[PDB]
């Protein structure tokens, strides 16, 4: 029904338990997270730097708060400083410096509620951070995932430093991406509900202001698991890892059904991310606990963490003259 392409995948690294959160920082260094690392049967997840020339893996941060180890599950870099925002299914949302120190951004949200554990996040170009939270309350609450009960939530961490819960009642909310229009403005928030075959959209009307929740797209397949991570290319096609499959789905800007599929040499892609200024997509996957790369048909969308650089700054917004 749908065209399938089969690009050459190249293995980057392997033996990363629960491999996810591929991300590039402001300098082009590459990081991933290993959520399933354990010590004595307890979480001890890791944030890793991967040297793309040598393949060498370096543990950047082994987060823990009051003796509760983390489950780092997704990442985005900051443009303002060379620090990573790490969605942690046990600890919430962390800011991790490249030197390994970290700060937990929130024990509680804007309503005084205990924070939920997070997994993916996405900046809009105005600087707000949109976050999926598939786990229940952070440590020291007992760990719970919204696999069977609809308690996964969505947050927005605004430029004013407010952690606002903007929706809930999701069954493993996973990938999240912002659709920016040609004038640079945030228009739609896209959210994967991984325990269904659905992608949801909201219209962004401002910081932490979303409305008009609708079904945006449908994920093919009848196996366990749907959309995990997702990313826009420069034409606002959305590439969506289908964890219940060996494909990445390609949606047009207006969603619906995929218009093309990318066949992968592996099952269970968990996350994907473009390398800045390239067509190269890095993909994490849980069949092999591994990281791969492949060349897409065009560039990715300009990334938040490049937006203060000469040659990028000033080129995102466009207006009538």
Curated annotation (Swiss-Prot):
Record note on what altering residue 172 to L does: 28% decrease in activity
UniProt KW keywords: Calcium, Hydrolase, Metal-binding
Result after altering residue 243 to H: 27% decrease in activity
Keyword Calcium attributed: yes
Record: residues binding Ca(2+) 1: 20, 119, 174, 228
Resulting phenotype, residue 286 to Y: 57% decrease in activity
Noted pH dependence of activity: Optimum pH is 8.0.
Required co-factors: Ca(2+)
Thermal behavior of activity: Optimum temperature is 35 degrees Celsius.
Gene Ontology MF terms: calcium ion binding; diisopropyl-fluorophosphatase activity
Effect of residue 172 to V: 46% decrease in activity
Pfam (any one): SGL
InterPro entries noted in UniProt: 6-blade_b-propeller_TolB-like, SGL, SMP-30/CGR1_Lactonase
EC annotation from Swiss-Prot or TrEMBL: 3.8.2.2
Catalytic activity from the UniProt record: diisopropyl fluorophosphate + H2O = diisopropyl phosphate + fluoride + 2 H(+)
Gene3D superfamilies: TolB, C-terminal domain (2.120.10.30)
Residues that, per the record, bind Ca(2+) 2: 231, 272-273
Documented effect of changing residue 243 to Y: No effect on activity
Signal sequence segment: none
Protein function: Biological function and substrate unknown. However, it is capable of acting on phosphorus anhydride bonds (such as phosphorus-halide and phosphorus-cyanide) in organophosphorus compounds (including nerve gases).
Protein name: Diisopropyl-fluorophosphatase
């Amino acid at each position: 029904e749908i065209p399938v392409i089969e690009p050459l995948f190249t293995k980057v690294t392997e033996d990363i338990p629960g491999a996810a959160g591929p991300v590039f920082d402001k300098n082009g260094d590459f990081y991933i997270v290993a959520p399933y690392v354990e010590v004595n049967g307890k979480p001890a997840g890791e944030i890793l730097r991967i040297d793309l020339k040598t393949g060498k893996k370096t543990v950047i941060c082994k987060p823990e708060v009051n003796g509760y180890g983390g489950i780092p599950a997704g990442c985005q870099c900051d443009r303002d400083a060379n620090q990573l925002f790490v969605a942690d299914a046990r600890l919430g949302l962390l800011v991790v410096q490249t030197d390994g120190t970290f700060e937990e951004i929130a024990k509680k949200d804007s309503e005084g509620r205990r924070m939920q554990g997070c997994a993916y996040c996405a900046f809009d170009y105005e600087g707000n951070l949109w976050i999926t939270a598939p786990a229940g309350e952070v440590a020291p609450a007992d760990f719970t995932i919204s696999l069977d009960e609809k308690f996964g939530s969505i947050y927005c961490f605004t430029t004013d430093g407010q952690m606002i819960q903007v929706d809930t009642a999701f069954q493993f909310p996973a990938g999240i991406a912002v659709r920016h229009m040609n004038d640079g403005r945030p228009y739609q928030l896209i959210v994967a509900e991984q325990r269904t075959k659905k992608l949801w959209s909201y219209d962004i009307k401002g910081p932490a202001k979303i409305e008009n929740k609708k079904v945006w797209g449908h994920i093919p397949g009848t196996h366990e698991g749907g959309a995990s991570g997702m990313d826009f290319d420069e034409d606002n096609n959305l590439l969506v890892a289908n964890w219940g499959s060996s494909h990445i789905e390609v949606f047009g800007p207006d969603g619906g059904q995929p218009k093309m599929r990318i066949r992968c040499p592996f099952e269970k892609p968990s996350a994907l991310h473009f390398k800045p200024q390239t067509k190269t997509i890095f993909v994490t996957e849980h069949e092999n606990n591994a990281v791969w790369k492949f060349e897409w048909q065009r560039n990715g969308k300009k990334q938040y963490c490049e937006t203060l650089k000469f040659g990028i700054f000033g080129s995102l917004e466009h207006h009538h003259h």
